[PDB]
Design a protein around this ligand. Structure first.
Ligand SMILES: [Mg+2]
Ligand SMILES: [Mg+2]
Ligand SMILES: [Mg+2]
Ligand SMILES: [Mg+2]
Ligand SMILES: [Mg+2]
Ligand SMILES: [Mg+2]
Lengths: 246, 245
């Protein structure tokens, strides 16, 4: 009998309302408008992926997080990590991504006493006033493109909760689109042999669309994966948070 | 054609999600500091629930409490992660000695992060140095018994998320204290499928209040199992008990 399957589905659908409530959608739309786009597709109804955003007068903090697991266990991690990120932003400010990650790690260790509790994160402080960007990541990269060149600011090879973090500071040039993605989109199986999309198809896709309006890029990226994937099930939670300077 | 493998996947996922929820519980700290001066009864309705409990040891005393978040199952379990972190923030912002201030601050921390979102909580600051207690609750009571009388320090009839004060009380020797969510008192059973209730609960506490707390815990489980019979578990159950002298 599939009556139990209906019960769980209704329970998870309501749990997705809780997980959506912790996402900064409204704030992103109201402050960045079309100078951002969000792609957020959990594998199940609730996932282990989420994203953060904190607007300041002089710039903004923006990031993506992939907590251990997907489904319900991943979604539980997402609640803890969202609160751990808020604590960290309050303890060290929103301008130092490496300090935020260090403090997030500590806050997580403080709440969780064999359990996979590690998490990937890519955090960026966009300092509009001083025209420079600070990035710090644990197994998450910052991709940047002007439609000609594709740069990848690689994150540390260590996940949060196992590592000391450092910021990568780049000049902030106009005409550049930035992309923060979890592994899910790049790991999506598909195509002729069932290989994951990968870093090379991803960098090419970004360069190809980087100069385009971000609402158009978002649509093209969704249609590019839908096409690639075909009949293959979604392998992992997908998140792409994009933002553009001038 | 019956894709039953999905039901296995979800079951294994929930069982692993219960390891995450158990990791946020202060079991180890409670056992290491209170030993047999405490007992915990924690039984979610499903694999994961909306109920949890807190504990924070200080040099001069301890903070102990129970929380019942909106819902049960997975949605309830998501609320517990948020509330656990909101309680940590509140303890850091106002200290672990003012239960009413902790509840106020927990409410604010919850409103900043987030739909039924209200929650019940009963928080107690046990002062060892002043030989007193401070209690504040939102739809949760503090029960006390010496095996003869039963005292109930009632919490506000409003939940955290609607509209808090401390009730200070002296610690007399031979008294056992009990913090329970509504789940045990709402358990359907008996002759007419009625919930256990406050009067059967007070009598149960009085009947066992003189026993070692590991024995009380067992008697409480056997009392509900008997009452419940064939009735399914109606809600998440939590009983956190503590004793001084
Ligand atoms: Mg994950
Ligand atoms: Mg990975
Ligand atoms: Mg992933
Ligand atoms: Mg509940
Ligand atoms: Mg109730
Ligand atoms: Mg309840």
């Amino acid at each position: 009998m599939a009556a139990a399957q209906k019960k769980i589905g209704d329970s998870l659908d309501y749990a997705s309302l809780i997980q959506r409530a912790i996402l900064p959608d409204r704030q992103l739309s109201a402050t960045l408008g079309e100078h951002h786009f969000i792609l957020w597709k959990p594998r199940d109804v609730v996932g282990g992926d989420f994203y953060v955003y904190r607007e300041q007068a002089d710039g903004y903090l923006i990031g993506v997080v992939d907590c251990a697991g997907h489904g319900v266990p991943g979604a539980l991690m997402t609640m803890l990590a969202r609160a751990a990120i808020d604590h960290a932003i309050e303890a060290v400010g929103s301008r130092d991504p490496a300090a935020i990650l260090g403090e997030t790690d500590q806050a997580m260790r403080s709440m969780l006493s064999a359990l996979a509790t590690n998490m990937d994160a890519g955090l960026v402080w966009v300092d509009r006033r001083r025209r420079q960007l600070a990035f710090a990541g644990a197994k998450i990269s910052l991709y940047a493109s002007d439609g000609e060149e594709v740069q990848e600011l690689k994150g540390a090879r260590r996940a949060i909760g196992d590592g000391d973090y450092r910021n990568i500071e780049v000049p902030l040039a106009p005409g550049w689109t930035f992309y923060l993605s979890t592994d899910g989109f790049l790991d999506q199986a598909g195509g002729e042999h069932g290989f994951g999309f990968g870093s090379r198809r991803f960098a090419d896709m970004l360069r190809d669309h980087a100069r385009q309006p971000l609402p158009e890029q978002a649509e093209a990226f969704v249609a590019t994966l839908a096409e690639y994937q075909g009949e293959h099930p979604q392998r992992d939670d997908i998140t792409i948070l994009s933002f553009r300077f001038d």
